[PDB]
Ligand binder design. Structure first.
Ligand SMILES: [Zn+2]
Lengths: 45, 304, 69, 310, 24, 101, 47, 33, 373, 138
């Protein structure tokens, strides 16, 4: 599951190589990198 | 001449109030060095249990991983120690955590939307919006998952707010609760406040009877100064109820007619528990630690 | 942000008493002082903990990049 | 952990300063006890710091632009060439995983330039380690020919109060953190409270910051009774003293009129000589964390120390 | 110049360890 | 038997043999003040006190100067033996008063 | 006026005896003040 | 036994003894004259 | 042009040297007045070239085994051929082998004169040059004795050094220089040190003494009203005088009899000052005799008091309290009088002893202030 | 005690601040003859001139406050030493007790006229002291 969140409409839409760096749902030029399911070790301190 | 048997003759204990959480007891004709020692141990030596290693799988909430992990550690768990063994730090993680050394608590919450008529309440507008301490599900593993059958791991205070969420956000973690002492981190404290106050002494030098007796009575809390009549002098009914505000000394009519001191031998202890052990158990363990400390030095080789 | 877990000074759990405090001020229409007393906060350190709490989390939550409008 | 001042001018609300808290209300004792606090140095409680008292974070943003008209450098990873364990920090797109811990030397982004036909990386370099808070891809300044070359990466640097960090009351009494004193070693009050911050009494005779002294007994009165007090200038008079006003409040609550408290030593355990001045003061945490010249040459000539100069 | 006006209602709210607000 | 816990500072120990300074690791006022109090009850102990060299270093120093017919080592051994018995008295009286309630 | 004093030195055909602290620093010689106001010689037994 | 020991930079010491206290200050214009 | 290149080269480059350190200074009353608290971070870096010999083969073999990350270790080993062998990448096995090869005789006749060197860290007997800029006078660049303090991130400095450096602990920075040869060591220990500097050469007056808490503590401790029991008295003595740290001159703590015999045995505050001198001054020399004065007038101490007249007869404080005028940086006081009769080393011991005594006495007797004043 | 502060600071706290002196004189006065818009033109009063009767314990009036602000704000050797040190650097004490320059040229026939080290000339006249400590000094 690859993700990219739109800055304006907040739609989670990922796009590959040789594609316009813009959201599909709305014409916005700024995207935000989404997260996935990883393992982050932490001390409860 | 002081003997340990001569101490048994004069040493007295007086229990004023013994609640499930806080106990108010007195230690009469004991030294400051012994009374202070118990208070120091009942706040440092006394250990406990609680999260230590929070393993995050996902956290899309506004509350940062470090902060959320720290909050889980602070939540006191209604877990009796002695059931757990002490973890060894030198061996690796695969050998380190066992069914005897670690307790696992999982948190898996996903926020969604709900249809309701709209200021509108977050419990109505969204589903699983507020993450509470009660949402930390106990997962028993290994050799013993039957020892905690009649003792389920539940937080001491369940309604503790851990996180606030909006639809789309999720929290997925595995917390490793271990055995630790309060000196290392406050998240291991067993008692809230263990402190003693010396018995206030009010040395009345003059009879100070009459209307000045009624003026003297207002200088101390209601149940402290008692007056027999207009005469028959002015006595101290319960010097223990005194707040030691020294209000009587800031009046020219009493500044030389009364003295304010203490009973160095008498201690009024007040011990409140965090919830793990009873206040008596905390005091008993404190006396047992002081004895064990002196015992460990007794059966020990004096090197060099 | 949210109500702190335990009083900074002594360590008395205060985190479970935030929503209950607002209910004592709204529904019960009590004063600030009497409301804190009914929650079991007699030390002035525990008293200021809830009394002085801002709760900016409710202001912070209104910005949600995961839900439209 | 921002906090609303108990002691405040009413204009604080008129400017809605509660939208942006600047400090925290701390139990401050005017005491010379540790020996590490003196004139420009103040003590912070260990157990307070362990509980998140005065904790802060610092955010730093970087712009990774590929401009230095034909596109040569491309975000991601080039085929056939791939140096060992880089996938631990960056995702398939060459951008880093938001939340990942980074130290100086670690890869902060990845790209491939055809001019060198090699897969290169932009390294993260700073003495302070960080975590990735935000990664934003910006593909602007083009009509139809769209491709990403500009990326904005935000670093979250956690900043716990360290020995050296400055702290100050709202009365211009700044001091560096001399030590994070343990609560067991800290002086404990009759109430059972140990101060969050310790200010040395030798600070006040030279600075003459009496506003802090009245702030101490006002903050204490307001914490007990649960009422904010007005500390707007010229509200009080020579006849209507604030020391008398909050003094009456302190006596009514059940505390000493002159703002003192009977405290006990953390080391010996015995009651201290006199009652210590303790209260609630709003404290602020300040954001701040070889050539041998002609004069040093002169000094080495001065000692007649010819081999040190040599 | 008019002097400030005093407050209202100011009872006790600190007693001994094993003693509550029973005494009025 | 661990030898790092109790050590005899020979650079201050009398040739023979009443006065001598002892150095205990991982200890402070807790045992220190309690131990010197009990050692001082001994009629043969001339001088006794405790001193912590510095708070950062985990050390505890206890000096025992006696009169004749008893070494400082014996005075320390008596001090530890009496403190153990003293704690037994405290533990016994507390158990009894719990039942007496 | 480094070049001016240098010109006057060259025209005089001057010999810098390297006896001033400044001159000694220029040529890396030990300063003649204090510890440099004497010489240290070792006493050797064999003839 | 109160005699002085040659090898003392009385020159620097003198200028330092006139310089250092002239920071506390007629004054410097007269000293400059 | 080349004229422009020189204007200047002489002022700007005729010099960044190597081997040094810097850090924010933090106060410390538990270290000696002639010492510096070095963080373990600096101690593991600031190495040194200690040539291997028969007298130090044991000490350096351990350092070589310990390596560059375990203190006291060694980062490198220099052979007699001139080559260097880094111990950084090596495991305990190779280090153990090289340690057993340190004192091997040189086969080559062209280097038989030479012996191997071990680039070890810093110990607890090395000298350092402490510098606080601007260095307006040579007292702002003194030689301090290294005292490595565990779990430290700042340079620890005693309060007696505050004056000379003109350094206030307001987030100030100090430079630490570690000279690399014995001639430079001897100089930093005997000429530029910190001891022989009790009297400034400007007026021959003291620049060393206790500054605030200690002065207020002394006025209270030496007051007539201050009495002490046997237990209290002996505690104050050992609290500041430790024979194991070489504070004594008699190898046994000597104690005066009480000033009150009956009903209860009690010692006066002034008797503690007499006992401290009795254990720090040489036994071979007689006690100090001084008739000085106080800053506090007799009127403050009540009717007919002589508490302004500071009186020392055969090293015994018999009259008067002790002010800033006695153990401060003030001429013809008790410390200065001790400095003239017993020397600079004894006066330093008295200052450190008094400094500890007041510090410990203040712990049990705090001091505050209110508005009622 | 001399621990901190003086009787002057104590008197400003408990009695009065006194006359606020600005650059050796009193408070500056406008072309209108007024020292403040509150005071009368050419007012013959001590308060108008800057004399503060108020103390810091009781508080100070706005006129006194502004005048104190004036006096308070009013308060808020490199090359000389460099010229001497460059010409005197070489000048030192020779083994023949005379003060000689770097080039051996004599500057002073003697360092005073007694050859005494200043760091020693202190108890050299303290005869009673030396007498009371005869055997100690011997
Ligand atoms: Zn509290």
């Amino acid at each position: 599951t690859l993700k990219y969140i739109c800055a304006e409409c907040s739609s989670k839409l990922s796009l590959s190589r040789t594609d316009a760096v813009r959201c599909k749902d709305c014409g916005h030029r700024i995207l935000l990198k989404a997260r996935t399911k990883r393992l982050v070790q932490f001390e409860a301190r | 001449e002081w003997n340990v048997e001569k101490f048994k003759k004069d040493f007295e204990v007086n229990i004023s109030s013994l609640d499930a959480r806080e106990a108010n007891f007195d230690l009469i004709n004991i030294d400051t060095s012994i009374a202070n020692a118990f208070r120091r141990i009942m706040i440092s030596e006394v250990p406990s249990v609680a999260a230590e290693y929070v393993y995050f799988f996902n956290n899309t909430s506004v509350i940062q991983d470090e902060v959320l992990a720290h909050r889980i550690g602070l939540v006191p768990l209604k877990v009796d120690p002695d059931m757990l063994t002490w973890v060894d730090s030198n061996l690796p993680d695969d050998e380190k955590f066992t069914d005897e050394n670690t307790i696992v608590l999982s948190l898996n919450v996903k926020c969604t939307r709900n249809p309701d008529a709209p200021s509108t309440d977050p419990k109505e507008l969204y589903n699983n919006a507020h993450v509470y301490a009660r949402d930390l599900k106990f997962e028993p593993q290994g050799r013993q998952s039957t020892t905690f059958a009649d003792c389920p791991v539940v937080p001491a205070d369940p309604d503790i707010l851990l996180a606030k969420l909006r639809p789309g956000q999720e929290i997925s973690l595995k917390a490793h609760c271990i055995l630790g002492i309060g000196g290392d981190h406050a998240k291991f404290s067993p008692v809230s406040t263990a402190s003693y106050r010396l018995l206030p002494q009010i040395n009345i030098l003059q009879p100070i009877k009459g209307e000045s007796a009624r003026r003297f009575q207002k200088c101390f809390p209601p149940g402290v100064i008692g007056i027999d009549e207009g005469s028959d002098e002015a006595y101290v009914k319960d010097a223990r109820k005194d707040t030691v505000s020294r209000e009587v000394l800031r009046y020219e009519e009493f500044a030389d007619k009364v003295k304010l001191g203490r009973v160095r031998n008498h201690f009024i202890f007040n011990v409140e528990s965090a919830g793990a052990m009873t206040p008596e158990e905390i005091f008993f363990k404190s006396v047992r630690i002081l004895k064990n400390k002196a015992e460990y030095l007794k059966n020990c080789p004096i090197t060099q | 942000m949210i109500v702190p877990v335990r009083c900074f000074s002594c360590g008395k759990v205060v985190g479970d008493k935030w929503e209950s405090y607002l209910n004592l001020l709204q529904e019960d229409e009590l004063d600030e002082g009497t409301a804190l007393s009914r929650l079991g906060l007699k030390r002035y350190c525990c008293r200021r903990m809830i009394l002085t709490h801002v709760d900016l989390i409710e202001k912070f939550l209104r910005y949600n990049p995961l839900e439209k409008r | 952990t921002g906090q609303t001042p108990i002691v405040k001018a009413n204009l604080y609300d008129d400017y809605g300063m509660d939208n942006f808290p600047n400090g925290f209300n701390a139990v401050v004792a005017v005491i010379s006890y540790t020996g590490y606090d003196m004139d420009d140095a103040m003590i912070i409680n260990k157990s307070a710091d362990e509980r998140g008292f005065g904790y802060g974070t610092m955010y730093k943003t970087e712009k990774v632009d590929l401009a230095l008209d034909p596109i040569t450098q491309h975000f991601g990873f080039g085929n056939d060439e791939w140096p060992k364990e880089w996938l631990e920090k960056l995702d398939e797109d060459g951008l880093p995983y938001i939340g990942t811990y980074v130290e100086e030397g670690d890869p902060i982004c990845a790209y491939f330039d055809d001019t060198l036909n090699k897969t290169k990386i932009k390294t993260y370099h700073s003495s302070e380690p960080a975590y990735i808070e935000e990664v934003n891809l910006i593909g602007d300044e083009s009509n139809k020919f769209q491709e990403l070359q500009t990326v904005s990466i935000k670093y979250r640097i956690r900043r716990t109060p360290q020995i050296g960090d400055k702290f100050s009351s709202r009365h211009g009494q700044k001091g560096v953190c001399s030590r994070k004193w343990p609560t067991i070693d800290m002086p404990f009050s009759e109430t059972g409270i140990q101060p969050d911050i310790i200010i040395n009494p030798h600070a006040f005779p030279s600075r003459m910051t009496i506003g802090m002294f009245v702030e101490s007994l006002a903050g204490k009165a307001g914490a007990l009774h649960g009422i904010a007090q007005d500390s707007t200038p010229w509200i009080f008079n020579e006849d209507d003293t604030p020391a008398d006003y909050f003094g009456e409040q302190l006596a009514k609550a059940g505390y000493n009129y002159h703002g003192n408290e009977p405290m006990y030593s953390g080391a010996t355990g015995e009651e201290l000589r006199a009652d210590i001045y303790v209260g609630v003061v709003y404290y602020q945490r300040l954001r701040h964390m070889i050539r041998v010249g002609e004069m040093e040459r002169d000094a080495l000539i001065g000692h007649g120390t010819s081999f040190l100069l040599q | 110049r008019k002097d400030v006006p005093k407050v209202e209602g100011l009872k006790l709210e600190h007693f001994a360890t094993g003693y509550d607000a029973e005494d009025f | 038997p661990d030898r790092e816990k109790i050590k005899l500072l020979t650079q201050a120990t009398s040739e023979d043999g009443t006065s001598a300074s002892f150095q205990i690791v991982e200890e402070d006022h807790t045992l220190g003040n309690a131990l010197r109090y009990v050692i001082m009850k001994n009629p043969d102990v001339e001088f006794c006190g405790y001193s912590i060299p510095h708070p950062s270093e985990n050390l505890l120093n206890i000096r025992i100067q006696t009169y004749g017919e008893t070494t400082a080592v014996d005075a320390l051994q008596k001090g530890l033996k009496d403190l153990m018995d003293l704690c037994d008295v405290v533990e016994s009286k507390f158990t009894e008063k719990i039942k007496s309630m | 006026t480094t070049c001016q004093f240098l010109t006057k030195a060259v025209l005089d055909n001057e010999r810098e005896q390297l006896d001033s602290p400044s001159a000694r620093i220029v040529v890396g010689k030990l300063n003649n003040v204090g510890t440099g106001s004497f010489d240290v010689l070792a006493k050797v037994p064999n003839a | 036994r109160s005699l002085i020991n040659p090898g003392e930079a009385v020159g620097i010491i003198a200028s330092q003894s006139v310089g250092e206290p002239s920071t506390q200050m007629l004054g410097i214009p007269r000293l400059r004259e | 042009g080349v004229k422009q290149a020189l204007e200047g080269l002489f002022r700007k480059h005729m010099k960044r040297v190597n081997y040094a350190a810097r850090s924010v200074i933090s106060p410390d009353p538990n270290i000696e007045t002639n010492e510096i608290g070095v963080p373990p971070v600096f101690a593991v870096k600031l190495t040194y070239p200690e040539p291997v010999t028969a007298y130090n083969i044991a000490e350096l073999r351990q350092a070589v085994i310990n390596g560059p990350d375990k203190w006291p270790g060694a980062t490198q080993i220099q052979n007699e051929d001139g080559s260097l062998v880094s111990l950084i990448g090596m495991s305990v096995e190779q280090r153990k082998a090289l340690a057993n090869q340190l004192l091997t005789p040189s086969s080559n006749v062209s280097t038989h004169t030479l012996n191997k060197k071990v680039y070890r860290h810093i110990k607890n007997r090395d000298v350092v040059l402490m510098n606080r800029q601007p260095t307006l006078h040579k007292a702002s660049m003194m030689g301090h004795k290294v005292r490595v303090l565990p779990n430290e991130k700042t340079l620890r400095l005693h309060y007696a050094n505050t004056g000379a450096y003109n350094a206030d602990f307001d987030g100030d920075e100090m430079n630490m220089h570690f000279p690399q040869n014995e001639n430079a060591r001897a100089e930093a220990l005997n000429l530029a040190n910190t001891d022989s500097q009790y009297l400034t050469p400007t007026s021959g007056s003291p620049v060393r003494g206790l500054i605030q808490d200690h002065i207020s503590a002394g006025v209270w401790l030496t007051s007539k009203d201050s009495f002490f029991t046997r237990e209290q008295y002996q505690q104050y003595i050992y609290g500041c005088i430790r024979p194991e740290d070489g504070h004594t001159t008699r190898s046994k703590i000597v104690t005066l009899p009480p000033t009150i015999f009956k009903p209860y045995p009690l010692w006066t505050g002034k008797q503690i000052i007499t006992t401290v001198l009795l254990n720090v001054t040489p036994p071979d020399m007689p006690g100090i005799n001084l008739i000085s004065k106080n800053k506090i007038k007799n009127e403050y101490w009540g009717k007919g008091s002589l508490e302004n007249e500071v009186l020392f007869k055969d090293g015994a404080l018999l009259c008067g309290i002790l002010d800033k005028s006695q153990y401060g940086a003030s001429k013809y006081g008790i410390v200065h009088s001790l400095h003239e009769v017993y020397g600079p080393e004894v006066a330093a011991k008295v200052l450190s002893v008094l400094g500890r005594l007041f510090t410990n006495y203040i712990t049990a007797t705090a001091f505050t202030c209110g508005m009622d004043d | 005690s001399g621990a901190k502060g003086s009787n002057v600071n104590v008197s400003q706290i408990m009695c009065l601040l006194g006359q606020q002196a600005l650059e050796g004189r009193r408070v500056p006065v406008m072309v209108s003859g007024k020292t403040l818009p509150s005071f009368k033109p050419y007012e013959t009063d001590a308060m108008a001139g800057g004399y503060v009767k108020g103390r810091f314990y009781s508080g100070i009036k706005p006129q006194e406050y502004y005048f104190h602000c004036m006096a308070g704000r009013e308060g808020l050797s490199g090359y000389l030493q460099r010229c001497l040190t460059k010409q005197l650097e070489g000048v030192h004490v020779s083994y023949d007790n005379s003060i000689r320059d770097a080039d051996g040229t004599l500057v002073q026939f003697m360092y005073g006229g007694d050859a005494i080290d200043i760091t020693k000339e202190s108890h050299m006249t303290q005869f009673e002291f030396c007498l009371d400590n005869y055997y100690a000094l011997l």
